Amino acid sequence: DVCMDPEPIVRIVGRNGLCVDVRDGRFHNGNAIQLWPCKSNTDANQLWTLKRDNTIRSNGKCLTTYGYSPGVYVMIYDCNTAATDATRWQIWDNGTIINPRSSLVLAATSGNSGTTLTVQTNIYAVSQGWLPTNNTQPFVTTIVGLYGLCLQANSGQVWIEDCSSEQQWALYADGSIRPQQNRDNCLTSDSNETVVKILSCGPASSGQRWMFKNDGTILNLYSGLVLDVRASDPSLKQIILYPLHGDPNQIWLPLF
Amino acid sequence: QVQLAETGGGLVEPGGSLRLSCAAPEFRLQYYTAGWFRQAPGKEREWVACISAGGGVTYYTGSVQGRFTISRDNAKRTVYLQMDSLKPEDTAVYSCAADLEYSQIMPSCRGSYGVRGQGTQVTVSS
Amino acid sequence: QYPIINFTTAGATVQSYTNFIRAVRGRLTTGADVRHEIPVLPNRVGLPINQRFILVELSNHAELSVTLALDVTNAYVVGYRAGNSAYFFHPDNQEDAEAITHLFTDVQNRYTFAFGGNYDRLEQLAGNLRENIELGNGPLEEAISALYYYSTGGTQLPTLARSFIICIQMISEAARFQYIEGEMRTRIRYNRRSAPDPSVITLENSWGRLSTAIQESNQGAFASPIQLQRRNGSKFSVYDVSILIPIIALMVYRCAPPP
Ligand SMILES: *[C@@H]1O[C@H](CO)[C@@H](O[C@@H]2O[C@H](CO)[C@@H](O[C@@H]3O[C@H](CO)[C@@H](O)[C@H](O)[C@@H]3O)[C@H](O)[C@H]2NC(C)=O)[C@H](O)[C@H]1NC(C)=O
Ligand SMILES: *[C@@H]1O[C@H](CO)[C@@H](O[C@@H]2O[C@H](CO)[C@@H](O)[C@H](O)[C@H]2NC(C)=O)[C@H](O)[C@H]1NC(C)=O
Ligand SMILES: *[C@@H]1O[C@H](CO)[C@@H](O[C@@H]2O[C@H](CO)[C@@H](O)[C@H](O)[C@H]2NC(C)=O)[C@H](O)[C@H]1NC(C)=O
Ligand SMILES: [Cl-]
Ligand SMILES: [Cl-]
Ligand SMILES: [Cl-]
Ligand SMILES: [Cl-]
């Protein structure tokens, strides 16, 4: 036949593990959409129905962008009163939520609690990553790569080492990979052969956003490069960002 | 776990020889690349020498090139390390291993080497 | 006469097994139908019969060699051949029975079991749960020798079921999951015999529902959560596909994508 896609009422988590929120729970037309700590109740301001028409609705009102230029805030609005194609959104497999008319992307240009959501030019940054799920917490696993060794981070340096039962990693909804022991530090890469480090997630930049792919590689979306173990040499204690070929030094596996 | 038996080791005067035998009762060692690793008390695990499954290809590190001889007996499922002309830098804990990661032998003995031995102390002192 | 993929346990290494599971995945799908970056197995509805099965020849250190048959539609084992005998799982519908007629034509005589192939059957016959049947290269070597000798009357019925549980998990479930593949990949590495974790057990039980949950989702988000388990017996729920993209390698055809 043909797959019947449903309309699951769900939360939308994004930057810094924060949820999409309707400011103060007020639903008058034009009210701003913000970034709030995820709740554990049934308040309608954080539960979003992924409707069959590429709209995103909460308490009847639609998720709508104020304009089609970068920097305008995303608001709550009547679904019939708003502009016909200002209420439409696409949720991509790589975590990006995009308005397909402006081609701009739902983003939170700040990490603070209460940050007004905006539409921005798609750079595949952590500030532009989202995950529709009722799961409040990040997914803590151990990332295993070449030779069955574990991805370990100590201070800013990150390398690969034989697994010891730190090596735990919080896979956040915004696409950032963070060490479990310090959840405001991210798996960062500056340039787009460069070396990966553990800087703060403050910038929430393209280069701190990662995507686990089906081929076994951890892919940086903006650059197109994947995680690589320099010359398949774990003793170098260097994880770099190399173009794609698919050898074991590029293959990883989350072992939760 | 340990699945290789170790026989050998001890104290030696610099410039002397020594043999390190290593067999596997229940492990089929004749199929996989076998190698030797060592580690000084301070640091750190370094590789010594490996040998192809068919004994055709062998690799050695710099500190042992020309002085150590790795060999194997696939009829007896054993692996040996002949340590001639020993230097005081060879003082470490030597362990035999068998890589099950790669079908062939890699340069610099690259691999996982998940099946290892108990390991014995080698001491080159005057 | 279908595609033949061969793998041996004599000197089996992590790469020879990685190349084996990858070669099995290559002959299972066309590779074209991919949904949310996870491939989809061909549809059984309008599938020609010469495109229905693939064969897997298994040999070990001993001279014994055994060949399995896999259903392309779900990568599961439907039967096996050993020498001049062929044994098939009890099919679950009239159509599956006829498709079995076309597997091992050139045999002395073929037999069909009274039981199906799902785990609740094989665990009862073997007298062992999946949580206690160990997996690894060693177990796979013993499973091959046991499968061959059943044609000669050497293997008891419980052991035959136990051997099936090992072959299905290490091949079928491995072709379906990079997770289960990597879990078998680490057993081959350090040469160990471990039983599958609750993580592996749950992924096997949920594979049927995970295929359904992903194909008919709304832009990746599930209609209802699927419950999974960690390495420890800890239960968590999955609401979206992004986390399962590194976990699932193949899905069974449920429905067709929208135009
Ligand atoms: C994520 O969590 C939220 C709340 O914890 C879930 O929303 C709730 O979803 C259920 C099922 O869709 C709703 O209950 C059902 O209502 C229908 C009405 O047609 C009724 O026929 C059923 O018997 C059942 O009672 C419930 O009202 C709803 N709660 C709200 C909207 O506040 C949501 O489903 C969860 N998402 C997923 C993907 O599991
Ligand atoms: C994020 O995912 C979407 C998935 O559709 C990608 O956008 C499309 O990618 C396909 C290639 O598979 C192109 O043919 C389309 O032109 C793209 N755009 C649209 C609107 O479909 C997008 O490229 C992905 N981003 C990254 C960095 O992989
Ligand atoms: C697995 O083994 C079988 C038999 O050893 C292979 O079939 C042979 O393939 C070669 C091509 O390299 C042909 O020349 C032979 O005639 C085939 N023999 C047969 C069909 O009996 C089969 O291709 C192997 N599969 C893989 C994936 O390597
Ligand atoms: Cl239809
Ligand atoms: Cl609020
Ligand atoms: Cl809602
Ligand atoms: Cl509308």
Side-chain angles (χ1 to χ4, degrees):
Chain A
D1 323 318
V2 152
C3 300
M4 289 173 69
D5 65 318
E7 305 180 332
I9 297 89
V10 86
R11 287 180 157 86
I12 300 188
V13 194
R15 178 167 175 173
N16 295 342
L18 301 193
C19 277
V20 171
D21 187 295
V22 177
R23 181 103 67 184
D24 293 331
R26 306 193 69 90
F27 282 94
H28 57 94
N29 267 9
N31 191 6
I33 301 301
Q34 59 173 352
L35 201 72
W36 208 250
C38 300
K39 289 182 293 193
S40 294
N41 59 19
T42 52
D43 294 349
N45 66 323
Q46 281 192 8
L47 299 171
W48 294 95
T49 308
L50 303 178
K51 282 281 180 171
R52 206 169 290 105
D53 58 353
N54 293 325
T55 63
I56 300 177
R57 308 190 175 187
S58 170
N59 201 242
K61 301 280 212 292
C62 279
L63 192 74
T64 320
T65 167
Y66 186 89
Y68 304 138
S69 284
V72 289
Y73 82 117
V74 169
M75 58 182 173
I76 199 60
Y77 220 93
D78 189 308
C79 296
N80 293 80
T81 307
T84 166
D85 38 5
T87 50
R88 302 304 147 94
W89 298 95
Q90 286 191 341
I91 303 171
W92 289 355
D93 285 320
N94 48 41
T96 286
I97 296 180
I98 175 172
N99 169 268
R101 225 221 91 170
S102 60
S103 72
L104 296 176
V105 155
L106 178 64
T109 77
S110 164
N112 281 338
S113 180
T115 290
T116 298
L117 265 46
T118 60
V119 289
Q120 295 287 1
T121 303
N122 190 25
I123 64 180
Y124 292 99
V126 169
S127 42
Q128 303 179 346
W130 310 89
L131 174 60
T133 178
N134 281 343
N135 223 289
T136 301
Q137 300 303 121
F139 196 52
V140 173
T141 87
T142 61
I143 309 178
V144 159
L146 175 69
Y147 301 148
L149 311 172
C150 273
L151 189 65
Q152 180 178 164
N154 287 261
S155 302
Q157 255 298 87
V158 50
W159 53 74
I160 196 182
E161 202 194 75
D162 39 6
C163 294
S164 179
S165 304
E166 255 300 329
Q167 302 166 338
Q168 291 180 334
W169 295 93
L171 301 187
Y172 267 61
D174 49 23
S176 62
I177 303 177
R178 311 195 187 191
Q180 208 277 343
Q181 293 292 73
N182 189 255
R183 290 195 170 181
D184 43 58
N185 275 335
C186 277
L187 193 77
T188 315
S189 53
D190 291 320
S191 186
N192 281 14
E193 251 273 359
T194 83
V195 174
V196 179
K197 285 205 294 179
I198 313 294
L199 287 316
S200 68
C201 312
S205 55
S206 44
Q208 298 173 302
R209 180 172 166 184
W210 309 90
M211 188 201 174
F212 284 80
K213 303 224 57 174
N214 196 253
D215 57 353
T217 54
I218 302 177
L219 180 271
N220 179 251
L221 292 161
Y222 184 30
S223 61
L225 316 166
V226 285
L227 284 176
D228 195 299
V229 183
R230 239 201 93 185
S232 309
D233 191 355
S235 54
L236 292 185
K237 285 179 180 279
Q238 286 180 36
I239 304 297
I240 73 168
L241 194 66
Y242 209 74
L244 180 273
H245 48 76
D247 292 4
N249 64 318
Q250 284 182 344
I251 305 307
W252 306 84
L253 184 47
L255 275 170
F256 47 92
Chain B
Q1 197 214 3
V2 189
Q3 306 180 30
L4 300 165
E6 292 235 1
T7 58
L11 172 72
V12 65
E13 171 159 354
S17 289
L18 194 36
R19 196 170 177 96
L20 283 178
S21 302
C22 177
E26 303 295 340
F27 181 83
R28 315 195 188 281
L29 189 48
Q30 70 274 35
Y31 287 120
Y32 308 93
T33 299
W36 289 95
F37 301 82
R38 69 187 174 187
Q39 188 173 215
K43 288 110 200 143
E44 174 182 6
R45 177 185 235 221
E46 86 186 56
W47 60 281
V48 184
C50 47
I51 178 174
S52 81
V57 182
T58 53
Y59 292 102
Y60 302 83
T61 181
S63 306
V64 311
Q65 207 148 43
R67 316 180 299 105
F68 285 11
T69 303
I70 193 179
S71 58
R72 75 194 307 150
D73 189 328
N74 285 11
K76 305 177 186 176
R77 298 202 313 272
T78 58
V79 171
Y80 313 99
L81 180 65
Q82 186 73 11
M83 303 179 296
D84 307 319
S85 307
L86 277 159
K87 301 182 187 296
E89 61 179 23
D90 308 320
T91 61
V93 185
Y94 285 63
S95 46
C96 43
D99 180 63
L100 293 97
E101 190 88 5
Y102 286 132
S103 295
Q104 310 140 325
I105 174 172
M106 297 294 202
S108 291
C109 306
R110 286 181 177 174
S112 66
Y113 291 87
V115 165
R116 71 164 186 87
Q118 322 213 354
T120 317
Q121 180 67 40
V122 175
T123 307
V124 194
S125 175
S126 187
Chain C
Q1 199 166 315
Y2 296 90
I4 290 179
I5 292 87
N6 35 27
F7 176 81
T8 180
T9 65
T13 165
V14 155
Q15 288 312 308
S16 65
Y17 175 73
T18 302
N19 295 333
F20 165 62
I21 294 304
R22 273 153 51 178
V24 172
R25 290 172 188 168
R27 295 301 178 186
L28 281 165
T29 52
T30 79
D33 195 5
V34 175
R35 319 206 192 178
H36 303 306
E37 309 187 0
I38 298 184
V40 166
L41 293 157
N43 189 15
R44 82 196 288 261
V45 179
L47 186 56
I49 190 147
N50 59 35
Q51 266 96 45
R52 182 78 179 272
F53 306 102
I54 61 164
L55 298 173
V56 174
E57 185 196 31
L58 292 178
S59 51
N60 63 339
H61 176 190
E63 74 180 87
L64 311 183
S65 183
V66 177
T67 294
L68 316 181
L70 269 63
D71 199 326
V72 156
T73 67
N74 48 28
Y76 211 82
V77 176
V78 291
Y80 84 99
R81 172 179 178 175
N84 64 337
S85 307
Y87 302 92
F88 304 106
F89 279 135
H90 182 273
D92 301 330
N93 57 76
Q94 170 199 0
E95 302 169 338
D96 292 355
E98 289 180 352
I100 287 176
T101 322
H102 309 68
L103 267 170
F104 308 107
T105 60
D106 51 325
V107 294
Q108 188 87 31
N109 201 254
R110 33 188 298 265
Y111 305 84
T112 291
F113 290 141
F115 46 84
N118 60 283
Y119 291 116
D120 296 9
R121 306 265 166 78
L122 296 176
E123 292 178 355
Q124 168 208 39
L125 297 167
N128 286 138
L129 301 174
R130 274 173 286 164
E131 330 169 3
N132 306 114
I133 293 176
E134 284 169 341
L135 296 172
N137 192 34
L140 182 62
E141 178 184 57
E142 303 165 2
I144 296 173
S145 288
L147 287 179
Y148 177 85
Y149 280 155
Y150 190 85
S151 55
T152 61
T155 301
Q156 218 66 268
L157 189 75
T159 301
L160 176 76
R162 185 187 183 97
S163 303
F164 275 135
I165 296 187
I166 301 183
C167 294
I168 288 161
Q169 286 194 278
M170 294 192 64
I171 308 178
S172 289
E173 302 285 6
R176 296 167 167 178
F177 300 87
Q178 309 97 317
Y179 195 92
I180 300 188
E181 187 196 355
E183 282 243 344
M184 301 303 101
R185 191 155 73 230
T186 186
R187 287 161 172 80
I188 302 183
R189 182 167 301 111
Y190 309 97
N191 191 259
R192 86 194 191 193
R193 309 164 55 99
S194 293
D197 306 334
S199 54
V200 186
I201 297 295
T202 301
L203 286 171
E204 297 174 344
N205 303 333
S206 319
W207 178 81
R209 307 198 300 277
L210 284 176
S211 299
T212 293
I214 293 179
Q215 295 183 19
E216 31 196 20
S217 60
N218 188 248
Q219 297 187 127
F222 297 159
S224 303
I226 273 66
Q227 193 179 209
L228 296 183
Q229 287 195 101
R230 303 184 174 272
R231 253 101 50 81
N232 52 333
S234 313
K235 301 173 212 82
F236 66 93
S237 302
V238 166
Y239 296 85
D240 194 68
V241 291
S242 89
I243 184 187
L244 297 169
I245 305 181
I247 273 75
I248 306 182
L250 299 172
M251 297 184 304
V252 62
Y253 191 107
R254 296 307 191 192
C255 41

